[PDB]
Amino acid sequence: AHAFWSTQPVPQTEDETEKIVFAGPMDEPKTVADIPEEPYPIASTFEWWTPNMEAADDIHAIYELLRDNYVEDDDSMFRFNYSEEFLQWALCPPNYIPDWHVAVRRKADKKLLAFIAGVPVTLRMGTPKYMKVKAQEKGEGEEAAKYDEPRHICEINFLCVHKQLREKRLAPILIKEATRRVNRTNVWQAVYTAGVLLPTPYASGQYFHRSLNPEKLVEIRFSGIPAQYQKFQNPMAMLKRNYQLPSAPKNSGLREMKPSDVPQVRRILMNYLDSFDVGPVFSDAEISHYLLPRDGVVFTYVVENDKKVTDFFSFYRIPSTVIGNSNYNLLNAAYVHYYAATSIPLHQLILDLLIVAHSRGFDVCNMVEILDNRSFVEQLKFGAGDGHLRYYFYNWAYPKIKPSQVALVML
Numbered sequence: 001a002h003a004f005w006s007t008q009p010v011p012q013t014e015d016e017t018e019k020i021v022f023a024g025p026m027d028e029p030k031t032v033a034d035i036p037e038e039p040y041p042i043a044s045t046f047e048w049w050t051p052n053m054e055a056a057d058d059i060h061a062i063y064e065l066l067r068d069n070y071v072e073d074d075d076s077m078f079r080f081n082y083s084e085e086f087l088q089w090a091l092c093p094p095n096y097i098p099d100w101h102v103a104v105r106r107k108a109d110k111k112l113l114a115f116i117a118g119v120p121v122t123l124r125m126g127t128p129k130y131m132k133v134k135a136q137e138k139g140e141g142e143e144a145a146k147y148d149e150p151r152h153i154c155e156i157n158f159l160c161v162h163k164q165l166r167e168k169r170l171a172p173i174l175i176k177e178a179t180r181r182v183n184r185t186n187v188w189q190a191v192y193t194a195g196v197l198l199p200t201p202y203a204s205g206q207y208f209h210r211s212l213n214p215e216k217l218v219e220i221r222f223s224g225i226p227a228q229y230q231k232f233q234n235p236m237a238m239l240k241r242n243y244q245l246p247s248a249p250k251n252s253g254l255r256e257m258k259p260s261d262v263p264q265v266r267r268i269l270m271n272y273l274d275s276f277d278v279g280p281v282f283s284d285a286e287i288s289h290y291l292l293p294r295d296g297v298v299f300t301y302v303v304e305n306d307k308k309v310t311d312f313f314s315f316y317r318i319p320s321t322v323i324g325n326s327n328y329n330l331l332n333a334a335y336v337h338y339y340a341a342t343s344i345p346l347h348q349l350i351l352d353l354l355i356v357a358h359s360r361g362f363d364v365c366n367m368v369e370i371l372d373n374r375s376f377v378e379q380l381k382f383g384a385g386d387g388h389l390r391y392y393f394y395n396w397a398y399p400k401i402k403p404s405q406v407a408l409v410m411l
C-alpha cells in the first residue's frame, strides 16, 4: 500500500509500534563514507537547488510556492500563508545547515516546483518514563537508558510539491535527497509532524482553537454561530460577549521579553521541558533566536517580579489565505509556542496570552494538545478543531506516548 514508506526505516504498523520497548535506531548503523557523493538522479528537465536563505529573492520563491501550494483545510477554504520574515526565522536558526534546505526547480525557467526544509534540533528522545518503569520490572534498565542523552538530529518541515506536479512521486524523491544531505552530515534521525496518517506516529493530538474576533471568524466560515445560540434572540452579540477579553493583561509584572531575559527564560523553560518524554534542548543562542520578539512573527512576554523572571509565554503568527470571501482576505492566527509557569496557574498565564493576542489584532489562538495545553482548554474556552497532528521519527523506534508527553512545538 506504500511503495515508498515500506522501503524506509520507520515502524511499519501499530503492532510493530506496540512491541517497541526501547528508544533506538531502526536501521543498519551506516557511515558518512557509505553515502553517495552525488545528488540523487533526477529527470533531465528538473534540477536540484539549494536556496540561499540570505537572498531575498530565494526566500520570495519559497514564499510564493508555499502561499499557493502549502497546507489547506479539508474543505479548501483556507491555506497557510507563512510570511517571508517568518520563513527566514524558521529556516535559519543558530548553526542551521544550508544544504538541508532542498528544492527542485524546472531548469528552463527556474520555477520552484517542490521544497523540503531540514533544521537542526537538539532532542531528548530516549525511552519514555512509562517504559522505563516497565524496564525496571524486567531488569532491563541499561538497555532502556542507552539513548537518554539529547541528540543533534534534523527537524523536517515545509514539504510542498506544486499543485501541477501532484501524484507523480516527486515527494519521495525530495525525501530521499533530503535524507542523503542530512546523512552526509552524520545525522541519522529526523522528527517531523503531519496531519495525514503515515507509518507510524509515536504520538497524536487534537487541534484546538480559541475565538478572539468571532464576528470575522463567522464571516469567513472558520466558525459557525452554533445551534444553541439560535434559541437566543440575538446570536452574535451573545457570541461576542462570550469570547470578550480584558484590554490589558491581568498579571502585574508582565512585559515584553528583552535580550537580558535570555538566561532566566532558558533556565525556566529547560526546567519545565524536563517533565516531558520528547523535548528540545535549547542553548542561550537558540532561546534568543526562537523567543525574542520579532515584529509580525513571534511575540514573547515574561512575568518579572522583584527583578526575576518567574513565568513567560510566547506565540507566533501565521496568517492564512481565505479562499474567496468578498469581505476578508486573511485569517490572522496566533499559535501557542513555548511557555513556563512557576508563580501562577497556567490558565492565568495563558489568559494574558489571549488578551495580548486579542489587543494586537489576532482573530483566533490555535494549538495542539501538547505540553500542558489541556489544563487551560475549558477555562480559556478553547474548542477542539478537526483532525489531529501526528508526530513521527525517521530511523527511530519509540513506544507510543500521550501528546501531553510531547514538548516539541513545530512551526
Ligand SMILES: CCCCCCCCCCCCCC(=O)SCCNC(=O)CCNC(=O)[C@H](O)C(C)(C)COP(=O)(O)OP(=O)(O)OC[C@H]1O[C@@H](n2cnc3c(N)ncnc32)[C@H](O)[C@@H]1OP(=O)(O)O
Pocket (backbone or CB within 6 Å): 001, 002, 003, 004, 005, 006, 069, 070, 071, 072, 154, 156, 157, 158, 159, 160, 161, 162, 165, 166, 167, 168, 169, 170, 171, 172, 175, 178, 179, 182, 183, 187, 188, 189, 190, 192, 193, 194, 195, 196, 198, 394, 395
Ligand atoms: C535522517 C534525515 C531524514 C530526513 C527525512 C525524514 C522524513 C521526512 C518526511 C516528510 C515529512 C513532511 C512534514 C510536513 O511538511 S507535513 C506538510 C506536508 N505538506 C502539505 O501537506 C502541503 C500540500 N501537499 C503537498 O504539497 C503534496 O501533496 C505532498 C508534498 C505532501 C505530497 O506530494 P504528492 O501528493 O504529489 O504525492 P507523491 O506522489 O509525490 O508522493 C506519494 C508519497 O508521499 C507520501 N506522502 C504524502 N504526504 C506526505 C507527508 N505529509 N509526509 C510524508 N510523506 C507523505 C505518500 O504516503 C506516498 O508514499 P507511499 O504511501 O506511496 O509510500
Ligand SMILES: c1cncc(CCNCc2cccc(-c3cccc(CN4CCc5ncsc5C4)c3)c2)c1
Pocket (backbone or CB within 6 Å): 071, 072, 073, 078, 079, 080, 193, 194, 195, 196, 207, 208, 209, 320, 331, 333, 335, 366, 367, 368, 385, 386, 411
Ligand atoms: C499540518 C501538517 N503540517 C503542518 C501544518 C501547518 C501548520 N499547522 C500547524 C498547527 C499548529 C497548531 C495548531 C494548529 C491548528 C489549530 C486549530 C485549528 C487548525 C485548523 N486550521 C486553521 C487555519 C488553517 N489554515 C490553513 S488550513 C487551516 C485549518 C490548526 C495548526 C499542518
Ligand SMILES: [Mg+2]
Pocket (backbone or CB within 6 Å): 161, 165, 166, 167, 168, 169, 170, 171
Ligand atoms: Mg508528485
